[model samples]
Target: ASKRALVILAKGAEEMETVIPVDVMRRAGIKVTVAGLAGKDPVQCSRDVVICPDASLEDAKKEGPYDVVVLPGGNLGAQNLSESAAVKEILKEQENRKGLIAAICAGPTALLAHEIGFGSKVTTHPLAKDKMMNGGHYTYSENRVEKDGLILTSRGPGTSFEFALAIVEALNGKEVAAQVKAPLVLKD
Candidate 1:
């Protein structure tokens, strides 16, 4: 079966963080759904880039469990996700099912907000460290990308490619990831 991914896209989401994963995972043959948090409207990203979501999160949720749930970060974007009951339920359900959850930059803070994946070693954008560590629930890492069991976390925009590739590797395989990586002409 083809792997399916649910990416909750909210207003002010980081454009790079949102798009990179969608693109990379699709290349790995994953069915990636970009679900807008605010109905089926096109979301205005942090850098003013707008993205049209495939479906509303409300509609997407009816589709059942996905292989992974992805969260992209911008200060305001993460904040919006953090405050959503829908977002919390999705993360909780994914966590309960032991499905993968990948977040980047301030995106990981949504985990903190929803009380998901606590006690996993994770990393976040440096500026987001304090919020992610507010209660000291999880060990922090300085790694560009950090994976602890089903929880995957990454730093910032600069690390988006690595983050997306890591998700591809997890859902697909090393060879698939490598094959996808080669043409990118990535450094290191």
Candidate 2:
């Protein structure tokens, strides 16, 4: 059976971070749902790229038990995610299930907001480090991609492909990930 992913989309999400993982996961045959946090409509990303969500988060939650829950970041987008009670519940449940929770850039800060992965080594955009480390709950890293157990995180827009491919490797396998990466002209 194909693996499934739930990507929470909100206003101000980084467009690159949001699209890269969704596209790469699809390339690896993962069933990805781009769920809208606000409603079942197009979300305006931080870069002004608009994306129509596959479903409202309310609807997506009912269909999940997703293999991964992905979070993309723009400062405001991450703030929105952090403030949502629904997002908190989703992250908490995903953590309890030991499912993967992948976040990028400011996205990792949401993990902090929900108190999801305490004591794990994680990374985020430099600007978000202080927010993520406010209470020293998680050890921070400068790596482009950081994966400590089920919590995976990465840096900013420049690292989006690396972040997405890392998710592919985790969900699929190194072999599948390599095959998917080859066509993207990514430097190894």
What is the C-alpha local distance difference test score of candidate 2?
0.95
Per-prediction TM-score = 0.99, 0.99
Candidates' C-alpha lDDT:
0.95, 0.95
The segments of candidate 1 whose C-alpha lies over 4 angstroms from its true place after superposition are none
Error of 1 at 120 (Å): 0.8
lDDT of 1 at 137: 99
State in Å the error of residue 162, model 2.
Answer: 0.9
Tens digit per residue, CA lDDT, model 2, 16-58:
8999999999999999999999989999999899999999999
